[PDB]
Amino acid sequence: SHMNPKRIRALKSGKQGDGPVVYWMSRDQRAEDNWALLFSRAIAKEANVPVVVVFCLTDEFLEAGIRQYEFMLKGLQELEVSLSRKKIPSFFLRGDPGEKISRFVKDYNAGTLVTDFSPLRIKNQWIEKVISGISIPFFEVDAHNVVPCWEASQKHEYAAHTFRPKLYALLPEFLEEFPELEPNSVTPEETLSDVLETGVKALLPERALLKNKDPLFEPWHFEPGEKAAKKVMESFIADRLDSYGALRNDPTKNMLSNLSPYLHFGQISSQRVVLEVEKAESNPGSKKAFLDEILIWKEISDNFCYYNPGYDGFESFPSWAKESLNAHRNDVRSHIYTLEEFEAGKTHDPLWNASQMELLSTGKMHGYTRMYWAKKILEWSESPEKALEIAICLNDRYELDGRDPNGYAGIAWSIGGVHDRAWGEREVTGKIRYMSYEGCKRKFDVKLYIEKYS
Ligand SMILES: Cc1cc2nc3c(=O)[nH]c(=O)nc-3n(C[C@H](O)[C@H](O)[C@H](O)COP(=O)(O)OP(=O)(O)OC[C@H]3O[C@@H](n4cnc5c(N)ncnc54)[C@H](O)[C@@H]3O)c2cc1C
Ligand SMILES: O=c1nc2n(C[C@H](O)[C@H](O)[C@H](O)CO)c3cc(O)ccc3cc-2c(=O)[nH]1
């Protein structure tokens, strides 16, 4: 087995039991290229026990909507089949992790517990509870980042150009092929259709609809699951990669990878993706541009959430920005929109409303327009605290890749200059990098973007 010990972290001591090794899957919903699954199999081998997979359908998802819930569970049904063809049983527990994972460990005489890693507050909520209801050893493995989150840095990194040296210096040690997942020796000692049916009915009153009372979301932009995530990656390498560096900041092109929803649910590994992109021969500049995103910005987001408890609040902005935004707290805002208005794209700005339409109808706003979109919320909000609330809310309710450290870090960047520099000082937004509507007229084909979305 080729398993780096620095990818793993003890969450609780225990006395090991004598039953299956239980992998509690959460962030990384895949069978292939999954260090958490791979380490859980290795421990089960070393203990002559089978490895099983447990997943919690939590009392939440009523906070998001059908788009995300469907994307995830369609992926998971494919995952049962996948893990079956490995003789690895998957149990799907309804309810919150505290109660259900504790009970599952007791009832199935688990030996050791392993989970994947996520810096989000809620996961730690779950962890705190699970830790009370078990007396067996507990491990988490960083299956999401290429360089483990507690390895990459010992602290918060204020700019990309400080985290980047540290991260690149560790790629030799941490970027490499996955061993194949070795199946179970034997097959060991209600369904997602019913559960998908039950939840959808519970969520259908909150579904987003255009006045016409017809549904607003379009499923077909992203086929969910592990097999489809490979295909999308392959389409990217083959077709969009060469142009990426040139056209990534242009909302009128389909030249992005479109991997974020897949990467969010962990239906595809970012280590895998990075390995394929490294292999490929493409226009100079492109490969550097894309790796800068999927290694530096993706992994600094986990860094941000992990070293900042208040990663979703003003207090985590850098000094200069807080000082700056405080000084402009009482400036009169040129507009103030209610939440409903932002949500239904009813602002005096045709480009903002279009970006909000792309979101509502596809569940994926273009990266470039996300920055415009979020900065305008700062500008048209009672306060910077309210701006974060509104952005976090809209991002999490409607993005397929939402509810993600990339989100909080991305919104903090936009609204408080996290991982950014001081810029020209203005009214209302202070020194926070400004993104004028006109700057977009210079930079890309605005009117065409607006036509695409109405
Ligand atoms: C206001 C705002 C909100 C955001 N919310 C989210 C979110 O909820 N979930 C999310 O995954 N990303 C978020 N981002 C970052 C980024 O916009 C998206 O990850 C990207 O557009 C996803 O599309 P893609 O896969 O085609 O990107 P590509 O250009 O094809 O990049 C490939 C991968 O690199 C990573 N990546 C690219 N850009 C960034 C970035 N700026 N920050 C962190 N990682 C990046 C993503 O994981 C992405 O899947 C947000 C950015 C902003 C400004
Ligand atoms: O373990 C779970 N992870 C879920 N996740 C994954 C989430 O990324 C992780 O729970 C955290 O990263 C902590 O592991 C969701 C993500 C979404 O975007 C939307 C809904 C869910 C729902 C669940 C869930 O019910 N259980």
Side-chain angles (χ1 to χ4, degrees), residues 244 256-260 263 290 293 364 370 395 401 406:
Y244 183 80
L256 296 180
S257 68
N258 297 323
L259 287 176
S260 59
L263 295 157
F290 179 79
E293 299 296 337
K364 188 160 181 288
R370 282 195 209 212
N395 188 86
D401 58 30
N406 280 0

Side-chain angles (χ1 to χ4, degrees), residues 23-59 61-66:
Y23 168 37
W24 168 26
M25 170 184 284
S26 188
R27 194 173 190 191
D28 298 274
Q29 299 159 27
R30 66 183 177 280
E32 291 186 76
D33 314 337
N34 182 331
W35 299 120
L37 192 44
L38 283 164
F39 276 50
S40 307
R41 178 66 187 97
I43 293 161
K45 192 76 172 305
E46 164 65 18
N48 315 107
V49 297
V51 61
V52 325
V53 173
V54 61
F55 182 90
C56 273
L57 297 329
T58 94
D59 320 346
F61 68 110
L62 285 146
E63 292 167 344
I66 290 154

Side-chain angles (χ1 to χ4, degrees), residues 236 244 248 255-261 263-264 290 293-301 364-375 391 395-396 399-414:
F236 174 67
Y244 183 80
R248 59 170 175 92
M255 295 292 138
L256 296 180
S257 68
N258 297 323
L259 287 176
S260 59
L263 295 157
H264 166 70
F290 179 79
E293 299 296 337
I294 196 161
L295 287 166
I296 318 307
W297 286 102
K298 170 159 172 302
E299 298 207 12
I300 211 174
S301 302
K364 188 160 181 288
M365 198 191 302
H366 188 276
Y368 195 74
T369 46
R370 282 195 209 212
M371 308 185 275
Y372 185 78
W373 179 90
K375 285 173 180 297
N395 188 86
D396 291 349
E399 294 280 18
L400 296 171
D401 58 30
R403 286 143 265 95
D404 192 285
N406 280 0
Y408 303 101
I411 292 161
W413 181 88
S414 300

Side-chain angles (χ1 to χ4, degrees), residues 1-7 35 38-39 41-42 176 179-180:
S1 81
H2 324 297
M3 312 268 176
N4 203 316
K6 275 162 180 164
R7 291 202 198 284
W35 299 120
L38 283 164
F39 276 50
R41 178 66 187 97
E176 57 208 354
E180 189 199 316

